[PDB]
Design a protein around this nucleic acid. Structure first.
Lengths: 92, 92
DNA sequence: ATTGCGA
DNA sequence: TCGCAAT
């Protein structure tokens, strides 16, 4: 599962030689907001998805999808088996 | 923009004649968790997406995508214009 | 209790 | 590291 911050850092920040601090100024958010994303310690909010799409000329939903897929896989790795053990599917 | 609780309510609960309280029991979550979703006052978490997919024999990512699309449109409706005013796209 | 956010 | 606000 790929944290969206890895794409942000590798596909955009490094590609265009833009620092997290420089990006935060262009996005009108605080430096720790971008830095925490790039360190893969914060997920991408809906607000951040719009800002990143707008600044980098990408789909906003592209960022939403990276996050939701990562969130789903991370939740599943943590609790998938327990959920499957306690919930019997309606087909039965 | 459709809150995922509307789909849950109309496509599943009413379709199978299952109450929010009965659904919460099958999902092993508290009744306000399901009720707040159906009243469109709470979004779908990654955990709930897994439980709903498991119980109703659907994709988990189906519920994740309903939520992410709703979250993005709601954020855009609130703040899209402000963001676009304050962020100049990197092109130029 | 956890997450996103700014200071 | 910390408090504030939303979830």
């Amino acid at each position: 599962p790929i944290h969206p911050g890895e794409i942000l850092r590798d596909e955009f920040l490094m590609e265009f030689d833009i620092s997290p601090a420089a990006l935060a100024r262009a996005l009108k958010v605080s430096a720790p907001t971008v830095n925490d994303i790039v360190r893969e310690q914060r997920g991408i909010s809906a607000d951040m998805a719009i800002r990143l799409g707008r600044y980098f000329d990408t789909s906003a939903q592209f960022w939403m999808n990276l996050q939701s897929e990562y969130s789903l896989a991370t939740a599943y790795a943590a609790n998938g088996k327990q959920i499957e053990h306690e919930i019997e599917p309606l087909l039965a």
